[model samples]
Target: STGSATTTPIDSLDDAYITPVQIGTPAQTLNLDFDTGSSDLWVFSSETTASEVDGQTIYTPSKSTTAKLLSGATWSISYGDGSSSSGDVYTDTVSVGGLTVTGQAVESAKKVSSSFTEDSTIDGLLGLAFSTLNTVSPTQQKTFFDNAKASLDSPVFTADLGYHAPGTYNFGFIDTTAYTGSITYTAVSTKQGFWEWTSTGYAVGSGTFKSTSIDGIADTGTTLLYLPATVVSAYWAQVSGAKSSSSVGGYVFPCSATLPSFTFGVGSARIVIPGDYIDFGPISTGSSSCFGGIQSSAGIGINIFGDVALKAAFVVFNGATTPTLGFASK
Candidate 1:
């Protein structure tokens, strides 16, 4: 069975959860995702009876050598992508970097779907998406931010990546090592739960793109930027071998493209995407390569900028104040 992760989804900084929790007899780690689209933070375990949870990374209590599991508290979560998991409620003396938060309600599932129950790379997923999406709290549960408030200076954490991918996702405290040159924050805008941005316009090579340009949504739930053909082809033309094919919104090109750098004007936020991401994976024979930045969605609607776009800078999901998100150094 093949396991898949969700599209690039913008984060929710609301009632942050996912701090360090000391639960169960041994102690485990758990975090929450303030994602409006989905929920669930299920870690795998050696005690997992299901083969599905195989290969997935687990939090071993005995290894922690300092945790405890509550016999009564247990949980299970399901996602729209057809993934699910179940586990017991444990407790751990949770801490972020230097602070300890109490009553860190921990849920460890013994069974998970192939979507995740099969991978051993990810330590765990913190369901900060929403408490409503969670089976843990009926009253509502706080997210990772809620717990880290004590340790932070402004009670704020920034995201550096524009999208999600390998080395793009660094949760907890934002590392100021990458592009630590400059950092800025934008005012919050209360529109929706996901990271929606006001696109000033679309341009290729600094020239205005004649094709229809739509607003950009900084959604972590999606993977690629869905743009009109005029826009995608114009961008792909810069890259060699990147052929333009007629598709839904605009165009999807095969690999073998001589792509160029792209700059997205998101309101006051002008972000650039690296060329490496402009050309993507699963290389094929027809194109012989893969595809560049623009690809044919064919089925899904709208253009998306996936994990390839997120690795460049820090992102701030400003649901804490409003729907606005702030960007900072990567």
Candidate 2:
């Protein structure tokens, strides 16, 4: 069986993509960030500190007859920005779109960072990366996809993230009509529990493609595209008035600056990210300086092909024994 769900951008900058998830017996629908960067299905719930609760819909396990506490199990995860969440675990009926996974591990958040409290739209995060990254203690739990893989028609999930519009996430099968041109497949390295792969090379706008191998993870949780400093510098150089600013952090350019498109290679295929998409958004309200969507991954330890890069094409997270990634032009 397969399932499909619509994922909508949280903000104008496409900061993150959120999908409606049905958790518990009566199906308490919560909008969760479908994050491919982490591996824990956590949610804001009755266990969470009341002060941390904003406008988010909280998951109440007591309301569900199907809910069962995973005694002694706990989970915690920290983000790149230091934001974190920790909680107890439960097994319940979890559904995404029409796909159902009985006894799926659903982490109930007891503590959450201020950043999460402020994000009123996002109730929690649903991790899609490999289960090896799960932060659960005592026993590691499989991801929702991993648990559903066996019954699925095919062991694969696809991400079709959009710009300002809503996109889609499909399970078990690829929507043939969702993309154009043939898909380009590449090997994935799951050593780090990420959808890590090497990009063949890149081009600045309409320039010639430079042959280089840039390894990075396909992370839907992250907001920006992070590459090598040299590559980021090259792209910024093409835009007049663009500079690496300390105050604003990362690269910023004049709002009026004419941005150029970025192109990256997936095997023989070239996926071009429109220049407008790279503009990101202004650093501050009414500010002339705008943040770039692409930044240097120098301090990040690893490059991240975040929403900025993934939204440009169709992405397939193939869950075969020897995993592989597929990219196709939309």
Candidate 3:
């Protein structure tokens, strides 16, 4: 079953892109982050207390005739940014766009971390990672994509995220019209439950591309691109008034300074991210200072090609045997 879903960017260079997902028999819809960094389709549900629900829409399985409880099963997951959620499990008919997967595991969030509860726009996370990475305890659960792929023409999904506009996520087939230029393919190593790969090198600003092997993941859930400390420092060196500020948390620079493009190596392909994408808008309302969307992955072991980088190119998450990543300029 081929399908396509519309993904909308919430704000200026927003941290995440959300898509509507339908759950249960009658189809209660919720906006969820289609996260490739982890596995587990969880939502704020009827089980959540009023205080914990915040402003998110809650899913009530009891209202759906097809909803079935997965007795004694539970799931808990944490993200790289330290956001977390956990709850009981239910088997329901989950639909995204026109594709519907029956008996898909729907995790109900009874408890969510402050990072999640405070985000009024986001209601849940829909994991697109390998099913093996699912957090369901006692009995692991398969993701909606995993179950849907069997009925699809191919086990694939493509993400086309725009800067400040609506994007599309196509499942089971590639929409050639959505991208430009040749799609470069790269081998993916999924030992870490991510679309992990080794980047051949990178360049800052107008600098020539250097050859430094960088291990990283293509994470759509994260807002910024995170690389090694050395790489982060070198990129900012090109900026006239840039500094690593603890108060600002990451590198902050003068908003007027013209930024430079950041290019990464993906096998034989050079994924060039424009300079303007590096500036993550203003640090505060009416502030002349801007935060660098690209930062150092100091504590985090793996680098992240988050929205800042991903939005620059069209990406294909090919789930075929020996999974691979396909990238092309938009």
Candidate 4:
């Protein structure tokens, strides 16, 4: 089996990408974030407090005949940014694009943090990461991708994120025409429940590539690219009038300044991010100062290649016995 879905940026800043998903017997359609960083397919549901519900869609299990309660099961998840949610569990028929999976864990949210409650663009998160990270207690549940993997023509999924535009997510097979050049494969470490890998080196614009190993995870759930302070500083230095500002919470520069492109190596392959891609847009409405897409990961504990970097390439999450990551220029 194979499935494909279009993912669109939820906001003008490309803060998050959302894709429509079908859940339950009546097919309760909800716009969900296809997050590769976590492992829980949680949703806003009838159980959620009414006050916490904003302009978002809610999944009502009582409306679906196939929805069954996972007796005594519960789940809770906290993201790096501090947003959190918790709820009881249910098993129902879930479908992404055209690929269907029966008895898929559907976490119904009973409580949600302010950030999630305020973000009306996404109804919930559909985790694509390894199932080992599932938050359900007693008996951990499998992610949507894990449950659908065996029936897929190939046990793999690909992310094709775009810059302020709609992208695509494909399951089971790769779309050869979606990328250019040969894909460079790298070993993935799932021990941490992430698609973690090491980048060989980096180059700022036309400068010589610096040889340094940078370990990070490919996180589509995140919004920006985060690297070591040294690398982030180097890239920002190339922009005139650029400086790290506590007031702004990150590196910012004059909107008119010419920005340098960033390039990171995956094995022998070099994926170059356009200069404009780093200019994340004005810090404020009608402001001349702009926030950068690349920031220091010192506080994050680990570097993250978020949507900013993923948009520059086609990424493959191969879920075989030996997992591997494949990257190709788009």
Candidate 5:
């Protein structure tokens, strides 16, 4: 059956939202971050080294009646922040919302980086990216969405990520009540296994929207919106007292600084992010210093429209054909 789910931000870190998924026969529920940046449904599991797991929940594959080992299959993944996870593979029943896949590839982690292991609230990542990016060895595995798309009324999903608020991730259908205005669609190129598209360009504040195209990926797993170094500098230049601090690791500004709205183009649709939200979370305990949610994507090779940017609009990930991206004011 078609399904959908609610994505809620964790208290400790509102950078990403997580949704619950049931795995295996008896249905062990695990909270997972639905990441569109990468492919590979991996989770902390009983197979993980005891020392590698902290206070996180683990998926017990051995307890699942439908679990089948994908002999010799292994997967390892590294993120932009250097966080990583690796593990063996299993085919089991995995359900999200109300949709179920009988033989989904479930990566059980044997090891995880400190960044991942320390995040106790997130038991795993459910990748919504193209199935071609799956890391299963010998033969690649399809994502839960890809495997279940044929059964859906429409091969589509929508991500309504909210800032410090609960959002909905809808599958097979779009809730007309969730967004306002008309949804603008853009052609996306999935050659990179991501929702990669070129923006008509961007503008800071009420400035003109240049036609310069910037290629980037829509990534729900990433915490901040990242752009090219030059573009980041241009935006920060408009803010007084804004500085690039190595100590803070990105751009930070005085909390009292008056900021202007930031806008980016998706095809002809211009999604404007509020100035206040661009400050992201505070950098200091006193809230005097605030971190810039938009940063430079120097080493990352591609710009990422992370939650900071995604939350500014209701995004539709249409998987029917050519995979179009539909954006509208949230």
Candidate 6:
């Protein structure tokens, strides 16, 4: 059985991210953007060339005698932000909270983004998502969750980022007591880092069935709810086409009348998100119609439950006890 794999990046309040306790003790502080979008603990290296590096704070391993470089195992990754990273791997002792995993895999990127360089507040990202989203070389990447799972009190680690507030990232043991009734747990697929499910139907207003069954995913990384055009059209049909008929960006409809409710059919569970969800739905950015959340992404197979939807349901990541995710309410 795994020991308690409690995860907490060391950081003071009012900060964007957290620092690991292990690194915290050594570096004597918390200074990093704790992330789950990717895996690997990468710090700025000393060999970083000022030229290839537009704007970044490179870390000298010499500062902490515990850091190591994995010779010949270098890699890079590009983000939608048009920025990228290039570096090698290291065998440093990684830590978070009171936990410590020795010879842990870390990335040592030589070239980084200017966005990262300009930030003198933090050093790098502490990715906690999954092995798939990892940018490290196959030989170099291993998420903290994986390493900690063995000794961790639980086999799973739930990431509750927006819990009490907007940036409160909580993990470790899941408190089932935080739920209301019998929680609804969703199954996962190996296709990607996404956890997909099905939506049986949709209701435009307080009317009848607006949908039958649709596939979806619980993506924490994605910020919106993207459905199919057919889904949106069917949704507005009951709400008077939602005041207008157009894909201003991702299907925006404002009816002087009652809108519809949102619901998903996850396995045998009927996950009905509050109707007010549609009211607080993401915005239609600058009339671009490329709204914030809940629209359409045909080619995109996953329909994200998103922060709006997730906040409604007290979802539990029971990986600490099982390879499964259990649910309840908060």
Each prediction's total of clashing residue pairs, residues at least 3 apart in sequence or on different chains, is: 87, 0, 2, 0, 0, 26
- Per-residue CA lDDT of model 3 for 35-139, tens digit only, reads 988889999999986787788988999999999999999999888778888989999999898999999999999899998888888989999888899999999
Model 4 regions lying over 4 Å from their true place: none
The list of candidate 2 runs beyond 4 A from truth reads none
Clashes of 5: 0
lDDT (0 to 1) per candidate: 0.48, 0.95, 0.90, 0.95, 0.90, 0.54
Poorest 10 consecutive residues by lDDT, candidate 2 = 276-285
Q: Among all windows of ten consecutive residues in candidate 5, which has the lowest summed lDDT?
A: 9-18
Query: What are the per-residue Cα lDDT tens digits for candidate 2 across 1-330?
Result: 999999999988898889999998898999999989999999999999999999999999999999999999999999987899999999999999899999899999999999999999999999999999999999999899999999899999999999889999999999999999999999999999999999999999989999899999999999899999999999999999999998878999998899999999999889999998898778989999999999999998999999999999999999999999999999
* Model 3 TM-score on a 0 to 1 scale: 0.97
* Model 2, residue 107: C-alpha shift (Å): 0.5
Provide C-alpha RMSD values for all models, in order: 7.7, 0.6, 1.1, 0.8, 1.3, 5.7
Clashes of 6: 26
Candidate 1, TM-score vs. the true structure? 0.66
Error of 1 at 43 (Å): 0.7
TM-score ranking from best to worst?
Answer: 2, 4, 3, 5, 6, 1
Name the candidate, 1 or 6, with the larger lDDT value.
6
TM-score, prediction 2: 0.99
Provide the clash count, candidate 1.
87
| Number of the candidate with higher TM-score, 1 or 5 | 5
- The number of clashing residue pairs in model 2 is 0
Off by over 4 Å in 1: 1-39, 60-82, 86-88, 95-100, 128-139, 161-192, 209-223, 226-254, 284-287, 291-305, 318-320, 328-330
Candidate 1 lDDT over 1-330, as tens digits, reads 111112222232111122233334344443323233344444566666656655544666556544566656667676534667777755555544334545555466677677564444443555434334556533333444455455454444444433333223333344566465555454432233234455545555555533333544454443456655556666777655555544423344444454566666555446666566555543444445454545543344544544445445566554453445555535
